[PDB]
Symmetry: C3
Subunit: 353 residues, 3 copies
């Protein structure tokens, strides 16, 4: 161990940068990312595939399979001229008998950048701390930062009418999942008005609100209540996730229904209560009938699928940022490069067995 | 809608299939000779398997690489086929084209119907259309002597597997002479022959019998698959032998009975000793491995077609594209954090 | 004979290995500095694992990408090497679907069966017998680390512990290069006479050496100290405190052991390492540890190995530039003029 302290963020490096949570990024930095991500989107949307990552190898570590997340990366890489390497849940070990210190050190010699969908957050940062190459947090038990950004992009693309974002209201209904926390962590970052409404039992905790509070002391934001049918009012965006528990204390079936199926379900009535043109968001996958009725999710005001596409939109740009940044800081000697190339040419042109 | 799928060859005309064979083969000849046509640069294909299939996987994964693309493998469990409506809708935003080796055919078409991107049927419980085409290419490459195809005889021996049905579905499409011979219990059913019949009412084809050692005669191509059942009533070891090991096994005698230069075909994998003896499959008249290579030959071209087709219909604004590119350049050249 | 495989370094001469090291390293330096030699454009490599191995998988998968190619992963179950479909069959059809083949096989016999029946080059990811793609990664590593007017042919490489295939391979390659090899290890776990027979044969050609049992003396004057793990043969995977029983007297690489060897004896481990067992942390994380460079070189070497085998395959099987040119025009015209 470092014998220090370290909780939830990684030690920074002077020569590389990670993406473990948005707590390490400023409002302006996130703005940069959204613009970059979106400029790239518009290029690819129109047939130009920016080869910003030619020949670069990304290692993907999953401890819990996630198709949406996997294909998003695997694809983002291809479009930009690179490759995504899938180390299936078992394929890897991460902490199986070989210390993360070891795994991190050797992975740094074999790929150009790292992403990991880890079970316990602690180990995603352990990885970010011990690797010499950029590390991205696919999602932990704590937050989902690659989603915070996908959703930021989505909201930007959908402001309706001279609301400037800083004055939009984003409301999250249901369980305090990491998706939930992340949404608050990002909206407050951007100086918006956030609110998590949800059952006395399943609200974001004081230790979490502590972080949200800190955010607004800097941006001009806000948060929270418990009494539904009132905090949804005037919402510009209504966001929900699923009711299952914590992939360990989960699936009580009719027990989920017990706690949430009074209110907490996003139906047309709930939608209307919020606003005439309140757009609906869901990180998917959605159990239709539970946290949201079909008429809403398949409705004219649903953007959950644009949002879905934007999961890629944002990882596309996030990869570019981290790599570009890594190259400054670690820039190639154009001379050494030129010689290395000639040396190789000559060898190939002249030697054989 | 503005796109096209490949779920069964029932939706394709003889001429369209001809196109495909030609395209597939022209591409084959280029790659055979060191030119790799980058027709799919940067395009992402999502591969959904519900039953692992290495031959089918590596075929696609490879086809994509050669054409400048990538194949993404969603392992049997990795995926899910969340209502298909949802899965289809969001997959359409993350890849350029889709292929799926599905257990129940119904769901492969549900996918094709709900996706906005082209969908390809890796193989269902019903048919195997990406094999119909691989095999067409193979037969074309092997006509011997002023037979023009439309007048070749293709004979399938054994169980009425989807491979079997597909073979009939394609040979009749092209106006050839098809025949499935096989045990009273395991012949293509009337609902299936109905389809075959319909094909010939348009092409000039033919089909079927039960009595072996006679329908093989004059065959130009002798084709078989394996005797196991339907991956669920995965038939009995010595019970398979019970029904098929009288005749129904392709041995030299059976081969000779068919024709002097009747070529042998098998979609593989082959249980040697059962549906075919080694002297046949490893024989001078076996093309089962060219056929194998052609599994790729055809998906190579199939992918190109669907994509090209998708681009017409959904063509890029060269202007919007040019600006989008400049915009990006400027941003990268001037902005940082 | 119109293609070449890489199953063991017993088929390669010292000079050939030298070629490989040079090629591998020239490529390394190019990539190290931002030039990605596209020597394998559009080429497809099929990777067959029967026992998952992330380090080996991502090494290949990556090597291919850098060189303009692709690595296809046939997971342990995905494939079947000898599953109801004879290797003869599997080999024949794999040869029509990829450009080159690698396989981490359980039983060596089947890796060679594959090499024999495939028409495309075959690489041995690692069998129960040897680990040839590691022999080369480690050769590169030692070259990059000679300290001081020792020329390699006169370096001493010492392997401590169990006679694993990694062990055998190390001796197989160091003797190949005319170096001084030694495996020290417990009376029960030394390289056998059938194996030393091969090592001997190597030195009758290169000027090498090998072996003892008494530790704290054969380590002396070592330029490289190398170890692997104490588990058994992925089947008699030993015993927890039974491994310790046999090896935890000596046979553990600690600073004392390191010092005993030499002032600047560099430490090597093919990884993964069970820290505390075959090596203490102060050693593996020490100033004289190169085990991580060595790790990077696993790729450094497969990078070049793939290039050699493919280049070699193209000589021998060269494209008709004319046929190629026409094929291309034919295709263009078809695409420019035909539709449905």
């Amino acid at each position: 161990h470092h014998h220090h302290s370290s909780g939830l963020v990684p030690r920074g490096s002077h020569m590389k940068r990670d993406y473990v949570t948005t707590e390490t990024y400023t409002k302006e930095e996130m703005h940069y990312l959204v613009d970059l991500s979106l400029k790239i989107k518009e290029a690819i949307k129109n047939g130009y595939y920016p080869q910003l990552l030619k020949n670069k190898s990304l290692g993907m570590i999953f401890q819990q399979s996630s198709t949406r997340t996997r294909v998003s990366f695997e694809t983002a890489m291809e479009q930009l001229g690179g490759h995504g390497e899938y180390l299936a849940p078992g394929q890897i070990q991460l902490g199986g008998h070989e210390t993360i210190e070891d795994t991190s050190r050797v992975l740094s010699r074999l790929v150009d950048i790292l992403m990991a969908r880890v079970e316990r957050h602690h180990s995603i940062v352990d990885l970010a701390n011990c690797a010499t190459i950029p590390v991205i947090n696919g999602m932990s038990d704590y937050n989902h930062p690659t989603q915070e950004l996908g959703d930021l992009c989505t909201m930007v693309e959908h402001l309706p009418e001279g609301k400037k974002l800083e004055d939009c209201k984003v409301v999250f209904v249901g369980d305090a999942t990491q998706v939930c926390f992340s949404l608050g962590l990002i909206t407050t970052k951007m100086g918006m008005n956030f609110v998590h409404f949800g059952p006395e039992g399943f609200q974001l905790n004081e230790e979490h609100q502590a972080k949200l509070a800190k955010n607004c002391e800097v941006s001009g934001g806000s948060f929270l209540v418990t009494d539904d049918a009132s905090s949804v009012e005037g919402a510009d965006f209504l966001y929900t996730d699923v009711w299952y528990g914590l992939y360990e204390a989960e699936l009580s079936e009719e027990e989920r229904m017990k706690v949430f199926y009074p209110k907490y379900q996003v139906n047309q009535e709930m939608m209307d209560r919020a606003g005439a043109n309140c757009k609906f968001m869901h990180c998917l996958p959605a159990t239709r009938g539970e946290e949201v009725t079909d008429e809403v999710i398949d409705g004219k005001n649903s953007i959950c699928f644009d949002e879905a596409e934007n999961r890629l939109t944002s990882i596309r740009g996030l990869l570019v940022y981290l790599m570009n940044d890594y190259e400054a800081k670690n820039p190639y000697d154009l001379i050494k490069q030129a010689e290395a190339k000639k040396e190789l040419e000559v060898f190939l042109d002249t030697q054989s067995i």
